[PDB]
Amino acid sequence: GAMQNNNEFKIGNRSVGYNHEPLIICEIGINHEGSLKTAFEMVDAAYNAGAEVVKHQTHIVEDEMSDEAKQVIPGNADVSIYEIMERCALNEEDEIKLKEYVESKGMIFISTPFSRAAALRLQRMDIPAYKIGSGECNNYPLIKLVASFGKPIILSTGMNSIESIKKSVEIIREAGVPYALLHCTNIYPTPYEDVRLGGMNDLSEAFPDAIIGLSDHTLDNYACLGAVALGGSILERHFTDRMDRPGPDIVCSMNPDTFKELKQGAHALKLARGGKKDTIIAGEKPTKDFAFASVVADKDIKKGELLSGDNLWVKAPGNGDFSVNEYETLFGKVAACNIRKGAQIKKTDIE
Amino acid sequence: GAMQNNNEFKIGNRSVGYNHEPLIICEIGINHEGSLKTAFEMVDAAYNAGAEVVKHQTHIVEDEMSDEAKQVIPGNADVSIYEIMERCALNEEDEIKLKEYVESKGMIFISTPFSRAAALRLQRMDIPAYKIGSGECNNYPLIKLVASFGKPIILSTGMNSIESIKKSVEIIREAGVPYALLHCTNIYPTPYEDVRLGGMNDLSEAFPDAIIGLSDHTLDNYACLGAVALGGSILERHFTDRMDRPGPDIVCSMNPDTFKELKQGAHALKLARGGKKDTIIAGEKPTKDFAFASVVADKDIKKGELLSGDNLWVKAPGNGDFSVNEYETLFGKVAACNIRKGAQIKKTDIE
Ligand SMILES: [Mn+2]
Ligand SMILES: [Mn+2]
């Protein structure tokens, strides 16, 4: 039940929450490999595919990592995280041009700051909402800074327990900004078996004021579609204009075609999800009228004979005086006239 | 939580339940339009597509409907239900040949009896499990007969409230047979908005011993995929060898290609569904090691100076002596030596 709720906030003019259309975040991330030309090509592909939001990563290497980062390699690469981020990072001027380009296509630009310096850059740019990546979910000092900007926060929760996340949510609530929690697994790519969609329920139950979604790094749309069925309001996958691009995140990115498929599926499952079993569906009425059973004579019954389980049965359609629900209530009734085998039992057939 | 359970039973050698691979029932139904040749063509298409189960409908018109049925038209047709069933019904000899053909392809044959006579025919054939359609979900006399055969029952629950279904489940439990409940909406085709996947949860909560699934009549796989994400164990769609076939149910049927897509998606979502947020994923360890923050000097600190929020900050990677969680614990500590701006704070750097 927890995920079926009225929680909502706006990112600019776009309302997100269970009662709204799911929102797909196209995470270009570092997929541009440091090139504004490639980034624009990817923004073009997102726009033409029907995207509403393009998300960036804001990398200021000096403030985001210490020299130790030069000695440590990610699971999906063979060089240091420092080398990757130095290679892919857009400087401030280029990132400002990227935000302008995204907005010139009528889409929303948001980003993930990976540092204090990055957070401050985005505040100067006045972005409408902040994403906090799973690597920074336990970075309470950074979250406190970002929350002070007064914009909604979308918090990815991979690599963190509910217990760890509580401290971040406390900081966010204290700042008085609305927020979303995205369930996430940070393996690039993520196997289906590690997704644990049930994590979304767990988050929603622990944090009843949270908007809930999924950030994903599997190779396809199945996990995100499943998330929508569960009640997810925000979906995030990395995004590329084409799958032959180089880069460590390309492998789990969606492309224009698969984005379009996700948007279509998300809409269908937004419509199909939730609701209640007992809700009466007007469209079924012709089916109920022909398919439901009425009580019929199973033998010729003479006037004055007793109705029973031996001489009554039930058959479609549902327009007879007695429904199958009343079948046993007729036992012991007296035939008021001769009753023909196969005929519906009428109220006038009994005394 | 209700749908995440250990409930199970077998249909022949095939185990069904939340902890098993989802089972897709290929409901040929009346799609053969009364022709054994067409029925065999459809069985061939199901086999070659990878189907495990072919489901029939067993129609003995005299016992399933009274003469009133000649005056009533289904929502998805323009002739009487009587005319449709008389046209499509396979006689006993032909239905026996159909069961043999399905089994000769190594698939399981089950069927839905729409009458007492049909139920008795299937008992003579010794089918491994019985399906009860939504039109018969409130046909308590028929359910009592079928349950007496001692085989598992798969009960569709469209057009019926939880209250109505309780009476059928009582009968089933009394007979001592295991059972599944399929959530269902009986409009042909069903709009996404009428699916109400939440109905599955409602059933599971009301009937905690039930295996739970979805029977569907939408135009595509989205609803069934959503059902798998929720914990569904049995999926049913009508099945045709090709979509250009005539017949009132063809429109919402899956074909070989879309069956294959559903089977693939059902497997992915069987893997991805459920689980817990706090579960530790071994594969994320390299990400945690590079991405998590450690405490660093934010200024040159001279020996004897106090550590504080002004001269400390936090940065990746996660191999420093102090985690971001310990950031505030260092406030007021005394520098045991000169500490260089940007360096990780070490245990030997404090008194
Ligand atoms: Mn990511
Ligand atoms: Mn059906």
PDB file of N, CA and C in Angstrom, chain B residues 28-115:
ATOM      1  N   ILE B  28      -5.959 -21.131 -26.183  1.00  0.00           N
ATOM      2  CA  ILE B  28      -6.499 -21.232 -27.536  1.00  0.00           C
ATOM      3  C   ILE B  28      -8.000 -20.984 -27.505  1.00  0.00           C
ATOM      4  N   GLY B  29      -8.656 -21.409 -26.430  1.00  0.00           N
ATOM      5  CA  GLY B  29     -10.050 -21.071 -26.211  1.00  0.00           C
ATOM      6  C   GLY B  29     -10.922 -21.526 -27.365  1.00  0.00           C
ATOM      7  N   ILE B  30     -11.653 -20.579 -27.949  1.00  0.00           N
ATOM      8  CA  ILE B  30     -12.486 -20.831 -29.137  1.00  0.00           C
ATOM      9  C   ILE B  30     -11.830 -20.314 -30.435  1.00  0.00           C
ATOM     10  N   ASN B  31     -10.551 -19.942 -30.363  1.00  0.00           N
ATOM     11  CA  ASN B  31      -9.855 -19.344 -31.515  1.00  0.00           C
ATOM     12  C   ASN B  31      -9.778 -20.251 -32.748  1.00  0.00           C
ATOM     13  N   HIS B  32      -9.920 -21.558 -32.550  1.00  0.00           N
ATOM     14  CA  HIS B  32      -9.927 -22.513 -33.666  1.00  0.00           C
ATOM     15  C   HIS B  32     -11.215 -22.488 -34.500  1.00  0.00           C
ATOM     16  N   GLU B  33     -12.226 -21.754 -34.038  1.00  0.00           N
ATOM     17  CA  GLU B  33     -13.486 -21.596 -34.769  1.00  0.00           C
ATOM     18  C   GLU B  33     -14.093 -22.950 -35.157  1.00  0.00           C
ATOM     19  N   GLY B  34     -13.962 -23.913 -34.253  1.00  0.00           N
ATOM     20  CA  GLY B  34     -14.559 -25.234 -34.422  1.00  0.00           C
ATOM     21  C   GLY B  34     -13.796 -26.226 -35.274  1.00  0.00           C
ATOM     22  N   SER B  35     -12.608 -25.845 -35.744  1.00  0.00           N
ATOM     23  CA  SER B  35     -11.836 -26.663 -36.682  1.00  0.00           C
ATOM     24  C   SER B  35     -10.642 -27.283 -35.974  1.00  0.00           C
ATOM     25  N   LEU B  36     -10.559 -28.607 -36.016  1.00  0.00           N
ATOM     26  CA  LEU B  36      -9.433 -29.317 -35.415  1.00  0.00           C
ATOM     27  C   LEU B  36      -8.129 -29.008 -36.169  1.00  0.00           C
ATOM     28  N   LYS B  37      -8.220 -28.818 -37.485  1.00  0.00           N
ATOM     29  CA  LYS B  37      -7.073 -28.415 -38.301  1.00  0.00           C
ATOM     30  C   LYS B  37      -6.481 -27.072 -37.853  1.00  0.00           C
ATOM     31  N   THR B  38      -7.345 -26.086 -37.624  1.00  0.00           N
ATOM     32  CA  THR B  38      -6.903 -24.791 -37.116  1.00  0.00           C
ATOM     33  C   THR B  38      -6.341 -24.957 -35.697  1.00  0.00           C
ATOM     34  N   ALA B  39      -7.015 -25.747 -34.864  1.00  0.00           N
ATOM     35  CA  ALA B  39      -6.548 -25.980 -33.484  1.00  0.00           C
ATOM     36  C   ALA B  39      -5.142 -26.593 -33.460  1.00  0.00           C
ATOM     37  N   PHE B  40      -4.904 -27.567 -34.331  1.00  0.00           N
ATOM     38  CA  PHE B  40      -3.571 -28.153 -34.455  1.00  0.00           C
ATOM     39  C   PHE B  40      -2.549 -27.143 -34.959  1.00  0.00           C
ATOM     40  N   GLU B  41      -2.935 -26.287 -35.898  1.00  0.00           N
ATOM     41  CA  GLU B  41      -2.031 -25.253 -36.380  1.00  0.00           C
ATOM     42  C   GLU B  41      -1.643 -24.324 -35.234  1.00  0.00           C
ATOM     43  N   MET B  42      -2.603 -24.013 -34.369  1.00  0.00           N
ATOM     44  CA  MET B  42      -2.327 -23.157 -33.217  1.00  0.00           C
ATOM     45  C   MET B  42      -1.477 -23.861 -32.156  1.00  0.00           C
ATOM     46  N   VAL B  43      -1.724 -25.149 -31.936  1.00  0.00           N
ATOM     47  CA  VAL B  43      -0.897 -25.937 -31.029  1.00  0.00           C
ATOM     48  C   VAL B  43       0.553 -25.982 -31.548  1.00  0.00           C
ATOM     49  N   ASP B  44       0.717 -26.184 -32.858  1.00  0.00           N
ATOM     50  CA  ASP B  44       2.052 -26.155 -33.478  1.00  0.00           C
ATOM     51  C   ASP B  44       2.751 -24.836 -33.205  1.00  0.00           C
ATOM     52  N   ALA B  45       2.039 -23.732 -33.407  1.00  0.00           N
ATOM     53  CA  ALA B  45       2.615 -22.411 -33.202  1.00  0.00           C
ATOM     54  C   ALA B  45       3.012 -22.182 -31.739  1.00  0.00           C
ATOM     55  N   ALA B  46       2.194 -22.668 -30.801  1.00  0.00           N
ATOM     56  CA  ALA B  46       2.504 -22.563 -29.372  1.00  0.00           C
ATOM     57  C   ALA B  46       3.743 -23.373 -29.016  1.00  0.00           C
ATOM     58  N   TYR B  47       3.792 -24.618 -29.487  1.00  0.00           N
ATOM     59  CA  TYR B  47       4.937 -25.495 -29.236  1.00  0.00           C
ATOM     60  C   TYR B  47       6.236 -24.864 -29.717  1.00  0.00           C
ATOM     61  N   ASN B  48       6.237 -24.439 -30.977  1.00  0.00           N
ATOM     62  CA  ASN B  48       7.425 -23.851 -31.587  1.00  0.00           C
ATOM     63  C   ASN B  48       7.827 -22.520 -30.934  1.00  0.00           C
ATOM     64  N   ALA B  49       6.872 -21.836 -30.304  1.00  0.00           N
ATOM     65  CA  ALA B  49       7.155 -20.571 -29.613  1.00  0.00           C
ATOM     66  C   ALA B  49       7.737 -20.797 -28.216  1.00  0.00           C
ATOM     67  N   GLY B  50       7.685 -22.035 -27.733  1.00  0.00           N
ATOM     68  CA  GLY B  50       8.217 -22.374 -26.423  1.00  0.00           C
ATOM     69  C   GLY B  50       7.183 -22.517 -25.317  1.00  0.00           C
ATOM     70  N   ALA B  51       5.912 -22.686 -25.673  1.00  0.00           N
ATOM     71  CA  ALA B  51       4.861 -22.774 -24.660  1.00  0.00           C
ATOM     72  C   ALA B  51       4.955 -24.068 -23.858  1.00  0.00           C
ATOM     73  N   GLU B  52       4.571 -23.978 -22.586  1.00  0.00           N
ATOM     74  CA  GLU B  52       4.529 -25.119 -21.685  1.00  0.00           C
ATOM     75  C   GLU B  52       3.127 -25.683 -21.536  1.00  0.00           C
ATOM     76  N   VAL B  53       2.119 -24.816 -21.660  1.00  0.00           N
ATOM     77  CA  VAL B  53       0.733 -25.193 -21.426  1.00  0.00           C
ATOM     78  C   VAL B  53      -0.158 -24.648 -22.536  1.00  0.00           C
ATOM     79  N   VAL B  54      -1.036 -25.497 -23.061  1.00  0.00           N
ATOM     80  CA  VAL B  54      -2.111 -25.047 -23.936  1.00  0.00           C
ATOM     81  C   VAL B  54      -3.422 -25.264 -23.196  1.00  0.00           C
ATOM     82  N   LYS B  55      -4.242 -24.220 -23.095  1.00  0.00           N
ATOM     83  CA  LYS B  55      -5.554 -24.338 -22.466  1.00  0.00           C
ATOM     84  C   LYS B  55      -6.673 -24.241 -23.494  1.00  0.00           C
ATOM     85  N   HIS B  56      -7.650 -25.131 -23.356  1.00  0.00           N
ATOM     86  CA  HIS B  56      -8.819 -25.176 -24.209  1.00  0.00           C
ATOM     87  C   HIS B  56     -10.041 -24.622 -23.439  1.00  0.00           C
ATOM     88  N   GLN B  57     -11.169 -24.488 -24.133  1.00  0.00           N
ATOM     89  CA  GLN B  57     -12.478 -24.323 -23.511  1.00  0.00           C
ATOM     90  C   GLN B  57     -13.341 -25.503 -23.931  1.00  0.00           C
ATOM     91  N   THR B  58     -14.000 -26.120 -22.948  1.00  0.00           N
ATOM     92  CA  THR B  58     -14.801 -27.296 -23.194  1.00  0.00           C
ATOM     93  C   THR B  58     -16.253 -26.865 -23.215  1.00  0.00           C
ATOM     94  N   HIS B  59     -16.840 -26.909 -24.407  1.00  0.00           N
ATOM     95  CA  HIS B  59     -18.187 -26.391 -24.639  1.00  0.00           C
ATOM     96  C   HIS B  59     -19.145 -27.500 -25.058  1.00  0.00           C
ATOM     97  N   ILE B  60     -20.125 -27.757 -24.197  1.00  0.00           N
ATOM     98  CA  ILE B  60     -21.234 -28.652 -24.483  1.00  0.00           C
ATOM     99  C   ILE B  60     -22.454 -27.754 -24.333  1.00  0.00           C
ATOM    100  N   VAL B  61     -22.931 -27.228 -25.457  1.00  0.00           N
ATOM    101  CA  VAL B  61     -23.869 -26.110 -25.445  1.00  0.00           C
ATOM    102  C   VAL B  61     -25.166 -26.419 -24.694  1.00  0.00           C
ATOM    103  N   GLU B  62     -25.681 -27.637 -24.846  1.00  0.00           N
ATOM    104  CA  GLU B  62     -26.955 -27.990 -24.222  1.00  0.00           C
ATOM    105  C   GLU B  62     -26.899 -27.868 -22.691  1.00  0.00           C
ATOM    106  N   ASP B  63     -25.758 -28.227 -22.098  1.00  0.00           N
ATOM    107  CA  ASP B  63     -25.594 -28.225 -20.638  1.00  0.00           C
ATOM    108  C   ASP B  63     -25.053 -26.912 -20.092  1.00  0.00           C
ATOM    109  N   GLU B  64     -24.516 -26.064 -20.962  1.00  0.00           N
ATOM    110  CA  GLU B  64     -23.895 -24.827 -20.495  1.00  0.00           C
ATOM    111  C   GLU B  64     -24.829 -23.615 -20.535  1.00  0.00           C
ATOM    112  N   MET B  65     -25.840 -23.662 -21.397  1.00  0.00           N
ATOM    113  CA  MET B  65     -26.775 -22.551 -21.522  1.00  0.00           C
ATOM    114  C   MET B  65     -28.196 -23.008 -21.851  1.00  0.00           C
ATOM    115  N   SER B  66     -29.175 -22.232 -21.388  1.00  0.00           N
ATOM    116  CA  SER B  66     -30.577 -22.506 -21.687  1.00  0.00           C
ATOM    117  C   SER B  66     -30.969 -21.780 -22.967  1.00  0.00           C
ATOM    118  N   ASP B  67     -32.191 -21.994 -23.441  1.00  0.00           N
ATOM    119  CA  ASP B  67     -32.598 -21.352 -24.703  1.00  0.00           C
ATOM    120  C   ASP B  67     -32.557 -19.821 -24.670  1.00  0.00           C
ATOM    121  N   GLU B  68     -32.592 -19.238 -23.473  1.00  0.00           N
ATOM    122  CA  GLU B  68     -32.420 -17.796 -23.322  1.00  0.00           C
ATOM    123  C   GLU B  68     -31.131 -17.290 -23.975  1.00  0.00           C
ATOM    124  N   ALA B  69     -30.104 -18.133 -24.015  1.00  0.00           N
ATOM    125  CA  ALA B  69     -28.798 -17.757 -24.570  1.00  0.00           C
ATOM    126  C   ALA B  69     -28.853 -17.444 -26.064  1.00  0.00           C
ATOM    127  N   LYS B  70     -29.906 -17.904 -26.733  1.00  0.00           N
ATOM    128  CA  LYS B  70     -30.113 -17.632 -28.152  1.00  0.00           C
ATOM    129  C   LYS B  70     -30.533 -16.179 -28.418  1.00  0.00           C
ATOM    130  N   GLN B  71     -30.902 -15.443 -27.365  1.00  0.00           N
ATOM    131  CA  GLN B  71     -31.379 -14.063 -27.494  1.00  0.00           C
ATOM    132  C   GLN B  71     -30.386 -13.023 -26.971  1.00  0.00           C
ATOM    133  N   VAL B  72     -29.228 -13.462 -26.482  1.00  0.00           N
ATOM    134  CA  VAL B  72     -28.275 -12.549 -25.836  1.00  0.00           C
ATOM    135  C   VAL B  72     -26.906 -12.551 -26.536  1.00  0.00           C
ATOM    136  N   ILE B  73     -26.427 -11.342 -26.820  1.00  0.00           N
ATOM    137  CA  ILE B  73     -25.221 -11.080 -27.599  1.00  0.00           C
ATOM    138  C   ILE B  73     -24.083 -10.613 -26.662  1.00  0.00           C
ATOM    139  N   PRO B  74     -22.892 -11.217 -26.784  1.00  0.00           N
ATOM    140  CA  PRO B  74     -21.717 -10.705 -26.055  1.00  0.00           C
ATOM    141  C   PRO B  74     -21.279  -9.308 -26.491  1.00  0.00           C
ATOM    142  N   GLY B  75     -20.538  -8.620 -25.626  1.00  0.00           N
ATOM    143  CA  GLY B  75     -20.026  -7.283 -25.951  1.00  0.00           C
ATOM    144  C   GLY B  75     -19.080  -7.220 -27.144  1.00  0.00           C
ATOM    145  N   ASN B  76     -18.413  -8.334 -27.449  1.00  0.00           N
ATOM    146  CA  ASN B  76     -17.425  -8.414 -28.545  1.00  0.00           C
ATOM    147  C   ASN B  76     -17.921  -9.229 -29.748  1.00  0.00           C
ATOM    148  N   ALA B  77     -19.238  -9.290 -29.919  1.00  0.00           N
ATOM    149  CA  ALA B  77     -19.827  -9.982 -31.059  1.00  0.00           C
ATOM    150  C   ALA B  77     -21.139  -9.337 -31.462  1.00  0.00           C
ATOM    151  N   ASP B  78     -21.705  -9.820 -32.568  1.00  0.00           N
ATOM    152  CA  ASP B  78     -22.989  -9.326 -33.069  1.00  0.00           C
ATOM    153  C   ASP B  78     -23.995 -10.442 -33.343  1.00  0.00           C
ATOM    154  N   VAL B  79     -23.689 -11.633 -32.845  1.00  0.00           N
ATOM    155  CA  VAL B  79     -24.617 -12.755 -32.844  1.00  0.00           C
ATOM    156  C   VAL B  79     -24.695 -13.298 -31.408  1.00  0.00           C
ATOM    157  N   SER B  80     -25.672 -14.165 -31.158  1.00  0.00           N
ATOM    158  CA  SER B  80     -25.873 -14.721 -29.824  1.00  0.00           C
ATOM    159  C   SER B  80     -24.699 -15.574 -29.354  1.00  0.00           C
ATOM    160  N   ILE B  81     -24.529 -15.636 -28.037  1.00  0.00           N
ATOM    161  CA  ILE B  81     -23.512 -16.495 -27.442  1.00  0.00           C
ATOM    162  C   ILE B  81     -23.773 -17.957 -27.810  1.00  0.00           C
ATOM    163  N   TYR B  82     -25.048 -18.317 -27.938  1.00  0.00           N
ATOM    164  CA  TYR B  82     -25.412 -19.656 -28.363  1.00  0.00           C
ATOM    165  C   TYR B  82     -24.844 -19.963 -29.747  1.00  0.00           C
ATOM    166  N   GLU B  83     -25.060 -19.058 -30.701  1.00  0.00           N
ATOM    167  CA  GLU B  83     -24.552 -19.243 -32.060  1.00  0.00           C
ATOM    168  C   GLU B  83     -23.020 -19.369 -32.088  1.00  0.00           C
ATOM    169  N   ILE B  84     -22.342 -18.558 -31.280  1.00  0.00           N
ATOM    170  CA  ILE B  84     -20.882 -18.567 -31.241  1.00  0.00           C
ATOM    171  C   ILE B  84     -20.397 -19.910 -30.726  1.00  0.00           C
ATOM    172  N   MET B  85     -20.995 -20.378 -29.636  1.00  0.00           N
ATOM    173  CA  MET B  85     -20.515 -21.604 -29.000  1.00  0.00           C
ATOM    174  C   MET B  85     -20.886 -22.840 -29.809  1.00  0.00           C
ATOM    175  N   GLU B  86     -22.056 -22.819 -30.437  1.00  0.00           N
ATOM    176  CA  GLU B  86     -22.429 -23.908 -31.337  1.00  0.00           C
ATOM    177  C   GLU B  86     -21.466 -24.003 -32.523  1.00  0.00           C
ATOM    178  N   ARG B  87     -21.043 -22.850 -33.034  1.00  0.00           N
ATOM    179  CA  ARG B  87     -20.115 -22.792 -34.161  1.00  0.00           C
ATOM    180  C   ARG B  87     -18.701 -23.278 -33.778  1.00  0.00           C
ATOM    181  N   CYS B  88     -18.233 -22.903 -32.587  1.00  0.00           N
ATOM    182  CA  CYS B  88     -16.838 -23.140 -32.181  1.00  0.00           C
ATOM    183  C   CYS B  88     -16.600 -24.434 -31.391  1.00  0.00           C
ATOM    184  N   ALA B  89     -17.656 -25.010 -30.825  1.00  0.00           N
ATOM    185  CA  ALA B  89     -17.520 -26.149 -29.921  1.00  0.00           C
ATOM    186  C   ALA B  89     -16.913 -27.380 -30.605  1.00  0.00           C
ATOM    187  N   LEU B  90     -15.912 -27.980 -29.967  1.00  0.00           N
ATOM    188  CA  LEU B  90     -15.385 -29.271 -30.407  1.00  0.00           C
ATOM    189  C   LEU B  90     -16.138 -30.368 -29.697  1.00  0.00           C
ATOM    190  N   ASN B  91     -16.517 -31.406 -30.440  1.00  0.00           N
ATOM    191  CA  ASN B  91     -17.193 -32.549 -29.834  1.00  0.00           C
ATOM    192  C   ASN B  91     -16.194 -33.350 -29.006  1.00  0.00           C
ATOM    193  N   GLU B  92     -16.664 -34.376 -28.308  1.00  0.00           N
ATOM    194  CA  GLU B  92     -15.788 -35.127 -27.417  1.00  0.00           C
ATOM    195  C   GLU B  92     -14.620 -35.797 -28.151  1.00  0.00           C
ATOM    196  N   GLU B  93     -14.889 -36.425 -29.296  1.00  0.00           N
ATOM    197  CA  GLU B  93     -13.820 -37.123 -30.018  1.00  0.00           C
ATOM    198  C   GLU B  93     -12.734 -36.144 -30.442  1.00  0.00           C
ATOM    199  N   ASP B  94     -13.141 -35.011 -31.000  1.00  0.00           N
ATOM    200  CA  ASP B  94     -12.188 -34.003 -31.452  1.00  0.00           C
ATOM    201  C   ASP B  94     -11.398 -33.395 -30.296  1.00  0.00           C
ATOM    202  N   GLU B  95     -12.036 -33.216 -29.149  1.00  0.00           N
ATOM    203  CA  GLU B  95     -11.327 -32.638 -28.011  1.00  0.00           C
ATOM    204  C   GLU B  95     -10.308 -33.614 -27.422  1.00  0.00           C
ATOM    205  N   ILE B  96     -10.641 -34.903 -27.435  1.00  0.00           N
ATOM    206  CA  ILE B  96      -9.699 -35.937 -27.033  1.00  0.00           C
ATOM    207  C   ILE B  96      -8.483 -35.951 -27.962  1.00  0.00           C
ATOM    208  N   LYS B  97      -8.708 -35.828 -29.275  1.00  0.00           N
ATOM    209  CA  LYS B  97      -7.595 -35.736 -30.234  1.00  0.00           C
ATOM    210  C   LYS B  97      -6.753 -34.477 -29.986  1.00  0.00           C
ATOM    211  N   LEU B  98      -7.401 -33.385 -29.588  1.00  0.00           N
ATOM    212  CA  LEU B  98      -6.682 -32.145 -29.280  1.00  0.00           C
ATOM    213  C   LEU B  98      -5.754 -32.296 -28.076  1.00  0.00           C
ATOM    214  N   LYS B  99      -6.245 -32.949 -27.027  1.00  0.00           N
ATOM    215  CA  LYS B  99      -5.444 -33.204 -25.835  1.00  0.00           C
ATOM    216  C   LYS B  99      -4.243 -34.085 -26.181  1.00  0.00           C
ATOM    217  N   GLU B 100      -4.474 -35.115 -26.997  1.00  0.00           N
ATOM    218  CA  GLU B 100      -3.402 -36.018 -27.408  1.00  0.00           C
ATOM    219  C   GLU B 100      -2.366 -35.282 -28.235  1.00  0.00           C
ATOM    220  N   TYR B 101      -2.825 -34.408 -29.129  1.00  0.00           N
ATOM    221  CA  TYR B 101      -1.908 -33.645 -29.969  1.00  0.00           C
ATOM    222  C   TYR B 101      -1.027 -32.719 -29.119  1.00  0.00           C
ATOM    223  N   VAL B 102      -1.635 -32.025 -28.158  1.00  0.00           N
ATOM    224  CA  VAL B 102      -0.886 -31.129 -27.281  1.00  0.00           C
ATOM    225  C   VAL B 102       0.176 -31.892 -26.502  1.00  0.00           C
ATOM    226  N   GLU B 103      -0.210 -33.039 -25.951  1.00  0.00           N
ATOM    227  CA  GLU B 103       0.712 -33.873 -25.191  1.00  0.00           C
ATOM    228  C   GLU B 103       1.785 -34.519 -26.079  1.00  0.00           C
ATOM    229  N   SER B 104       1.457 -34.794 -27.341  1.00  0.00           N
ATOM    230  CA  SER B 104       2.449 -35.308 -28.301  1.00  0.00           C
ATOM    231  C   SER B 104       3.547 -34.281 -28.612  1.00  0.00           C
ATOM    232  N   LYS B 105       3.293 -33.007 -28.306  1.00  0.00           N
ATOM    233  CA  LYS B 105       4.294 -31.948 -28.428  1.00  0.00           C
ATOM    234  C   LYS B 105       5.010 -31.670 -27.103  1.00  0.00           C
ATOM    235  N   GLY B 106       4.763 -32.497 -26.090  1.00  0.00           N
ATOM    236  CA  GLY B 106       5.426 -32.358 -24.794  1.00  0.00           C
ATOM    237  C   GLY B 106       4.902 -31.212 -23.948  1.00  0.00           C
ATOM    238  N   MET B 107       3.720 -30.705 -24.296  1.00  0.00           N
ATOM    239  CA  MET B 107       3.095 -29.628 -23.539  1.00  0.00           C
ATOM    240  C   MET B 107       1.966 -30.169 -22.676  1.00  0.00           C
ATOM    241  N   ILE B 108       1.567 -29.374 -21.692  1.00  0.00           N
ATOM    242  CA  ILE B 108       0.487 -29.730 -20.785  1.00  0.00           C
ATOM    243  C   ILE B 108      -0.835 -29.238 -21.370  1.00  0.00           C
ATOM    244  N   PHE B 109      -1.849 -30.101 -21.354  1.00  0.00           N
ATOM    245  CA  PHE B 109      -3.201 -29.723 -21.765  1.00  0.00           C
ATOM    246  C   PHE B 109      -4.074 -29.574 -20.526  1.00  0.00           C
ATOM    247  N   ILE B 110      -4.685 -28.402 -20.384  1.00  0.00           N
ATOM    248  CA  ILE B 110      -5.769 -28.200 -19.439  1.00  0.00           C
ATOM    249  C   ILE B 110      -6.919 -27.515 -20.173  1.00  0.00           C
ATOM    250  N   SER B 111      -8.060 -27.380 -19.511  1.00  0.00           N
ATOM    251  CA  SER B 111      -9.196 -26.754 -20.147  1.00  0.00           C
ATOM    252  C   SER B 111     -10.106 -26.116 -19.113  1.00  0.00           C
ATOM    253  N   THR B 112     -11.007 -25.274 -19.604  1.00  0.00           N
ATOM    254  CA  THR B 112     -12.031 -24.649 -18.791  1.00  0.00           C
ATOM    255  C   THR B 112     -13.371 -25.298 -19.125  1.00  0.00           C
ATOM    256  N   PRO B 113     -13.985 -25.999 -18.156  1.00  0.00           N
ATOM    257  CA  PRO B 113     -15.339 -26.472 -18.404  1.00  0.00           C
ATOM    258  C   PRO B 113     -16.320 -25.341 -18.164  1.00  0.00           C
ATOM    259  N   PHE B 114     -17.251 -25.162 -19.098  1.00  0.00           N
ATOM    260  CA  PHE B 114     -18.309 -24.164 -18.972  1.00  0.00           C
ATOM    261  C   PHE B 114     -19.630 -24.800 -18.547  1.00  0.00           C
ATOM    262  N   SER B 115     -19.587 -26.091 -18.217  1.00  0.00           N
ATOM    263  CA  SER B 115     -20.769 -26.831 -17.781  1.00  0.00           C
ATOM    264  C   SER B 115     -20.401 -28.044 -16.941  1.00  0.00           C
TER     265      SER B 115
END
